Design an enzyme around this catalytic site. Structure first.
Site, PDB file in Angstrom:
ATOM      1  N   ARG E  55     -74.051   7.143  10.242  1.00 52.83           N
ATOM      2  CA  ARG E  55     -73.496   7.269   8.901  1.00 52.83           C
ATOM      3  C   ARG E  55     -73.580   5.928   8.192  1.00 52.83           C
ATOM      4  O   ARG E  55     -73.167   4.904   8.738  1.00 52.83           O
ATOM      5  CB  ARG E  55     -72.039   7.765   8.935  1.00 52.83           C
ATOM      6  N   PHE E  60     -69.614   0.379   1.459  1.00 49.77           N
ATOM      7  CA  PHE E  60     -68.315   0.793   1.978  1.00 49.77           C
ATOM      8  C   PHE E  60     -68.243   0.730   3.498  1.00 49.77           C
ATOM      9  O   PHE E  60     -67.430  -0.038   4.026  1.00 49.77           O
ATOM     10  CB  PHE E  60     -67.986   2.201   1.460  1.00 49.77           C
ATOM     11  N   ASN E 102     -61.289   7.095  12.485  1.00 52.84           N
ATOM     12  CA  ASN E 102     -60.170   7.992  12.708  1.00 52.84           C
ATOM     13  C   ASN E 102     -60.279   9.201  11.785  1.00 52.84           C
ATOM     14  O   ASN E 102     -60.902   9.146  10.721  1.00 52.84           O
ATOM     15  CB  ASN E 102     -58.835   7.265  12.485  1.00 52.84           C
ATOM     16  N   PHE E 113     -66.662   1.794  13.307  1.00 46.89           N
ATOM     17  CA  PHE E 113     -67.501   1.513  12.151  1.00 46.89           C
ATOM     18  C   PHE E 113     -67.351   0.056  11.732  1.00 46.89           C
ATOM     19  O   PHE E 113     -66.279  -0.545  11.868  1.00 46.89           O
ATOM     20  CB  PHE E 113     -67.178   2.450  10.972  1.00 46.89           C
ATOM     21  N   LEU E 122     -58.725   2.433   3.004  1.00 56.36           N
ATOM     22  CA  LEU E 122     -58.598   2.600   4.444  1.00 56.36           C
ATOM     23  C   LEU E 122     -57.431   1.823   5.038  1.00 56.36           C
ATOM     24  O   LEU E 122     -57.283   1.803   6.264  1.00 56.36           O
ATOM     25  CB  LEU E 122     -59.897   2.178   5.137  1.00 56.36           C
ATOM     26  N   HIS E 126     -56.669   2.831   9.805  1.00 60.42           N
ATOM     27  CA  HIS E 126     -57.607   2.556  10.882  1.00 60.42           C
ATOM     28  C   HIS E 126     -57.201   1.263  11.576  1.00 60.42           C
ATOM     29  O   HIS E 126     -56.510   0.414  11.007  1.00 60.42           O
ATOM     30  CB  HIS E 126     -59.046   2.474  10.354  1.00 60.42           C
TER      31      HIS E 126
END
Ligand SMILES: O=P(O)(O)O[C@H]1[C@H](OP(=O)(O)O)[C@H](OP(=O)(O)O)[C@H](OP(=O)(O)O)[C@@H](OP(=O)(O)O)[C@H]1OP(=O)(O)O
Ligand SMILES: [Mg+2]
Ligand SMILES: [Zn+2]
Lengths: 55, 170, 261, 52, 175, 167, 278
Positions: E55, E60, E102, E113, E122, E126
């Site tokens: 991903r 980001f 998460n 990530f 976020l 996380h």
RNA sequence: CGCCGCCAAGGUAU
């Protein structure tokens, strides 16, 4: 560290520290003299010094 | 690619900034206070000598001035957003005080800092298919038989009643 | 110098940085009245630099002459305004580095200077802005300068007084002939000449630049005010009106005949 | 600067006009003065025309 | 100086080699014991070999730690996923940070990530357990290409070829 | 949590009071919000003494992070207790402590010119901090009921309103 | 000094209502405060609370209103960012010579981000240079040296950012200011630099001179030294700030001809650096 | 024998 008593509010309003210092004077003067001698010998044995970055 | 050094020491210093040096100006041995200290010292040593003409440098022919910055300190910075602008001269063109007003006499109505801050954060007659779509004097694309029946209805056009004058072309 | 540079044209190309550097150094010179010559020299050399494919140095000196107009000498300020006038003439107005958005508000305190050369060059540049740059404002400035253009009158040159009525006409072409109209009718009780006839001509120019039937009912209405000067002003404004329109008076003769009787 | 003992003024004033509006208001004020003096003296023969 | 790095000091460092280059990840083992423990254990097991980055949201996030390549395969060495371990000094105000991926509640495993910018949405969601030593952050800035074909999963994702452990506290074993 | 909640109660929302206790406007204030938001001595002097103890507790927590030793903290908070006014702006709303600043600035020489006797060194390391500490305890020892009464009057003026034509 | 309408026999016969007649003139009191600017605003007497204005970097060490008003008339209308855009346009246009170096593919001007020109805690890169392979950079150093050992990591791209400051009589040494600022931003974690390699250029507006601190590929240093001497010699924004100082300060020359300044080496000999003849 | 170290209200209306 100097662990210490306190007197605080339930909601967390203000935390009064409740202790009078109470130091006896000849041991006080001897501790300050001992750290005076050790700190003179510490500054004598340092190549250069940088203080704090005070904020 | 950026290869690594393969070490266990972290990225920077161990104190994590506790010994900031603030070496923006001239450093310690080259500062003008140090030059004045050297000049004062060598004027204190050479006293029995009377014009030995080794001359020692420029300032030695016979702490003020550029003062040393505190190396252990950042200056506490604040953003002074508030301008001093003659509003009655800016948006109107005549200040009542004339030249006695303490403000700026500015007329540039450009954006401030905070405005940049809160701006940066965000056929058609019979409605059938084009059976031979063909034109008139005035761009009107019609059909063949539909515009023939339209001329049988009225000798002018359909959109703006233009004088067709018997002129019908592809 | 102007005739020399006009005869040269393209061939003066390895000379313009030296000449313009001589001008930009010359433009201080003790302020012992040798500064209007450099600005007049810029106003002469404005033409030949466009025909020599040079606009970067035009953008260099435009923002120089944008704020060398804070002078106290009127004889220097008039030449500064003439140089900026020649810049606005030879260069397209929407592609100049001192744009009209902040140039005309710097021209508005210069308008309150009663020297005739400063007034002449200022209102000529204001007229050039009023017929070619009327979109760079907040629509409130053309209304607050037309009151100051009343005090811009009684200047004895006849060039200022013939340019300012055209500025009134293009102001009313910009922002409509209904708000400057009351200003031009309030300029008809002065007791002084060269201020009531010079707004009579302004009533004629607001009548003739934009379409008619926007100034005529109030001009008929002001005759009901029992004063000598406003009635003489509306009659002389009808005189200059029909003199300026000519063939367009075929529909308005029957309307002002009961006033003329 | 002495902000308390200076010749002061109010913001957004606009100032005072030139000679034209000043003597216009002077002539209107003298008109009102003449009308109030003939009002006190009660003169029935004083008349103003259609042109001032 | 006035730069103010605004972070607690680190302890422990590992090396990670991809086709995009070398990345030296240094961890906060004191401020996050269980997540750094799982990370050094899965690095010592050579578990991230042939693991691709499945991903990429440019600017980001860029996600890794999936041996399956679908976005749901995560197996900790605990038997069950572990808790969230937050810190007020460890927030998402910059790039180069590493955080366990998460999906709501306390569900953290091998799925993590790298950050690519400001990630204030976020925060408090996380577990930040490490950063990347600079002069090597551009080997993971090369991971953000616009070749994605979708919201995620580009044509040729970069794979991890090896994972070395430069410093290893709280001694562990591969089973 | 109290000096920011005063601002949050008084419906300002443009003074960014930060953790190192300063105060900054953000919005180029007009007249109806300039005259509403300016504080006297009770807010500001409390803000500077809280900034002073904020720098002290930041020094102690910097020590207990584990990257600086005891002599360096000694010279540090000696500089803090000896050079207020240079870095806190506490003299601005109460001038009487200025003499006390001078009372610090003098006694430091009593310290600093007795390190330098002999082959010791001209550089920093002056970590005898008790003397400035005693006099800035003597400050708060007499100023605590004063700005206690001032902040009590502030809470009275804020919460039950003012008295226009009473006393 | 001031000569323009000092006596002012008949000004223009206006009204002079209350304050413009009897009040004092503010423009000599502000041009005199403008004239002693680095020694009314010096940074190192009280080094505590400094108050920088919007869009500027003066920092105003003091609560002086007259100096603040006299310094904002010479930073009036977005000319800080205009100096930014003008000098970055100059030092991106001068890199059209691409093959005189090893090879230069493109010179990317990145996204024009406002507030960047005066943000002192954080920073970004201003323009970027790309390459095909292996620009051999040196150790980071100044531009006043000539050694160029050149033993470092071969990198791809190379960022160039410019910086601005203002005088103040106690810190005018940008050979140290650029070095300290580049060390601060290469040890910073807020940076969004494309590389840790590229040079940071610092120019000193009040007491106008130039320096830089970074690593250098062989076609970089002696090119841009003369290229930014050309920027200091010819620039619209950095000269209209000078003539705006002249209009806010009333300085005038009293010579008939130009004072011997040209593209000759005589003219940078007296830029307060030490140059000897042998 | 060696003074002195400065904030704000006073202005861009309500
Ligand atoms: O400049 P001096 O009159 O010679 O006195 C200075 C000065 O102390 P004072 O100004 O308060 O008298 C320094 O403090 P600063 O005000 O410059 O910050 C101080 O250094 P500390 O801050 O560590 O106390 C130390 O100067 P130095 O840096 O050399 O130690 C000191 O005496 P000396 O200059 O004679 O050493
Ligand atoms: Mg008043
Ligand atoms: Zn004013």
């Amino acid at each position: 560290i100097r662990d210490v008593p306190v007197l605080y509010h339930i909601t967390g309003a203000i935390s009064f520290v409740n202790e009078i210092p109470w130091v006896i004077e000849p041991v006080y003067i001897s501790q300050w003299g001992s750290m005076w001698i050790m700190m003179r010998r510490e500054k004598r044995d340092r190549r250069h010094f940088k203080r704090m970055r005070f904020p | 690619v950026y290869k690594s050094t393969r070490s266990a020491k972290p990225v920077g210093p161990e104190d994590m900034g506790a010994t900031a040096v603030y070496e923006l100006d001239t450093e310690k041995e080259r500062d003008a206070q140090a030059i004045f200290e050297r000049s004062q010292k060598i004027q204190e040593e050479l006293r029995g000598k009377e014009d030995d003409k080794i001359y020692r440098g420029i300032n030695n022919y016979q702490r003020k001035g550029p003062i040393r910055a505190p190396e252990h300190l950042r200056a506490t910075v604040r953003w002074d957003y508030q301008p001093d602008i003659c509003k009655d001269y800016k948006e109107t063109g005549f200040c009542g005080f004339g030249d006695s007003c303490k403000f700026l006499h500015d007329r540039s109505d450009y954006k401030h800092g905070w405005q940049i801050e809160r701006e940066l954060d965000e056929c058609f007659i019979c409605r059938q298919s084009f059976q031979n779509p063909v034109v008139t004097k005035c761009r009107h694309y019609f059909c063949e038989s539909c515009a023939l029946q339209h001329f049988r209805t009225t000798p002018r056009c359909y959109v703006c009643d233009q004088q067709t004058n018997g002129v019908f072309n592809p | 110098f102007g005739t020399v540079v006009n005869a040269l044209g393209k061939r003066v190309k390895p000379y313009l940085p030296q000449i313009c550097g001589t001008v930009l150094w010359r433009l201080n010179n003790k302020s012992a009245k040798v500064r209007q010559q450099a600005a007049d020299l810029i106003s002469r050399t404005a033409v030949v630099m466009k025909t020599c494919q040079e606009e970067k140095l035009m953008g260099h000196l435009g923002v120089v002459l944008y704020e060398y107009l804070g002078e106290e000498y009127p004889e220097v300020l008039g030449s500064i305004l003439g140089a900026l006038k020649a810049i606005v003439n030879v260069i397209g107005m929407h592609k100049m580095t001192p744009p009209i958005k902040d140039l005309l508000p710097r021209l508005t305190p210069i308008l309150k200077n009663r020297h005739e050369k400063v007034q002449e060059n200022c209102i000529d540049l204001v007229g050039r802005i009023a017929d070619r740059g009327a979109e760079y404002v907040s629509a409130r400035e053309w209304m607050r300068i037309c009151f100051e253009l009343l005090e811009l009158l009684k200047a004895h040159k006849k060039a200022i007084r013939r340019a300012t009525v055209n500025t009134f006409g293009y102001i009313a072409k910009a922002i409509g002939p209904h708000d400057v109209l009351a200003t031009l009718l309030n300029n008809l009780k002065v007791q002084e000449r060269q201020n009531r006839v010079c707004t009579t001509v302004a009533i004629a120019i607001v009548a003739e630049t934009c379409s008619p039937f926007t100034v005529l009912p109030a001009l008929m209405n002001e005759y009901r005010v029992p004063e000598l000067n406003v009635q003489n002003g509306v009659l002389k404004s009808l005189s200059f009106l029909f003199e300026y329109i000519g063939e367009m008076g075929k529909d308005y003769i029957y309307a002002v005949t009961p006033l003329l009787e | 600067m002495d902000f308390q003992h200076r010749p002061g003024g109010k913001t957004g004033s606009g100032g005072v006009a030139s000679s034209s509006e000043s003597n216009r208001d002077r002539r209107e004020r003298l008109r009102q003065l003449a009308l109030e003096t003939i009002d006190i003296n009660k003169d029935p023969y004083f008349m103003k025309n259609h042109l001032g | 100086s006035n730069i103010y790095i605004q972070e607690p000091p680190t302890n422990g460092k590992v090396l990670l080699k991809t086709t995009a280059g070398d990345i030296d990840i240094e961890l906060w083992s004191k401020e996050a014991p269980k997540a750094c423990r799982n990370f050094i254990q899965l690095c010592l097991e050579a578990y991230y070999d042939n693991t691709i980055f499945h991903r990429v949201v440019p600017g980001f996030i860029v996600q890794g730690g999936d041996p399956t390549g679908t976005g749901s395969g995560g197996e900790s060495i605990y038997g069950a996923p572990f808790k969230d371990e937050f810190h007020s000094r460890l927030r998402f105000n910059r790039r180069g940070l590493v955080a366990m991926a998460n999906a709501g509640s306390h569900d953290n495993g091998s799925q993590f990530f790298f950050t690519l910018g400001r990630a204030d949405e976020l925060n408090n969601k996380h577990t930040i357990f490490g950063k990347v030593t600079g002069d090597t952050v551009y080997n993971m800035l090369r991971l953000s290409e616009v070749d994605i074909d979708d919201d995620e999963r580009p044509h040729n994702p970069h794979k991890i070829k090896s994972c070395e452990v430069l410093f290893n506290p709280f001694d562990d074993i591969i089973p | 949590n109290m000096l920011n909640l005063l601002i949050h109660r008084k419906n300002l929302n443009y003074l960014h009071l930060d953790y190192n206790f300063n105060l900054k406007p953000v919005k180029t204030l007009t007249t109806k919000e300039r005259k509403k938001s300016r504080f006297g001595n009770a807010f500001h002097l409390c803000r500077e003494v809280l900034r002073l103890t904020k720098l002290v507790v930041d020094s102690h927590v910097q020590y207990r992070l584990g990257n600086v030793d005891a002599f360096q903290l000694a010279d540090g908070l000696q500089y803090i207790f000896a050079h207020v006014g240079q870095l806190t702006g506490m003299y601005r709303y109460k001038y009487k402590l200025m003499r006390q600043i001078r009372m610090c600035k003098d006694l430091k020489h009593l310290i600093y010119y007795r390190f330098n006797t002999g082959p010791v060194g001209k550089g920093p390391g002056c970590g005898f901090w008790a003397a400035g500490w005693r006099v800035w305890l003597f400050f708060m020892r007499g100023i605590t009921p004063l700005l206690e009464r001032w902040l009590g009057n502030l809470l009275a003026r804020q919460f039950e309103g003012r008295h226009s034509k009473g006393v | 000094w001031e000569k323009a309408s000092g006596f002012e026999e008949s000004m223009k016969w206006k009204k002079l209502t209350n304050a413009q007649r009897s009040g004092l003139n503010q423009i000599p009191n502000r041009r005199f405060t403008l004239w002693w600017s680095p020694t009314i605003n010096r940074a190192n007497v009280y080094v505590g609370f400094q108050v920088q204005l919007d869009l500027t970097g003066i920092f105003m060490h003091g609560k002086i209103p007259t100096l603040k008003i006299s310094l904002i008339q010479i930073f009036r209308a977005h000319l800080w960012q205009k100096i930014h855009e003008s000098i970055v346009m100059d030092l991106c246009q001068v890199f059209d010579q691409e093959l005189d170096a090893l090879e230069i593919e493109t010179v990317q001007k990145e996204t024009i981000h406002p507030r960047k020109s005066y943000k002192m805690n954080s920073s970004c890169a201003d323009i970027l240079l790309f390459a095909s392979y292996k620009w051999n950079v040196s150790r980071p150093s100044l531009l006043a040296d000539s050694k160029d050992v050149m033993d470092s990591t071969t990198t791809q791209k190379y960022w160039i950012d410019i910086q601005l400051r203002w005088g103040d009589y106690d810190s005018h040494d940008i050979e140290r200011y650029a070095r300290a600022k580049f060390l601060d931003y290469t040890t910073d974690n807020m940076s969004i630099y494309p590389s840790p390699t590229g040079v940071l250029i610092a120019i000193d507006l009040a007491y106008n001179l130039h320096s830089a601190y970074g690593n250098w590929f062989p076609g970089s240093k002696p090119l841009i030294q003369q290229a930014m001497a050309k920027i200091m010699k010819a620039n619209p924004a950095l000269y209209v700030l000078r003539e705006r100082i002249r209009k806010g300060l009333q300085l005038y020359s009293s010579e008939p001809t130009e004072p011997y300044l040209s593209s000759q080496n005589y003219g940078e000999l007296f830029s307060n650096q030490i140059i000897w003849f042998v």
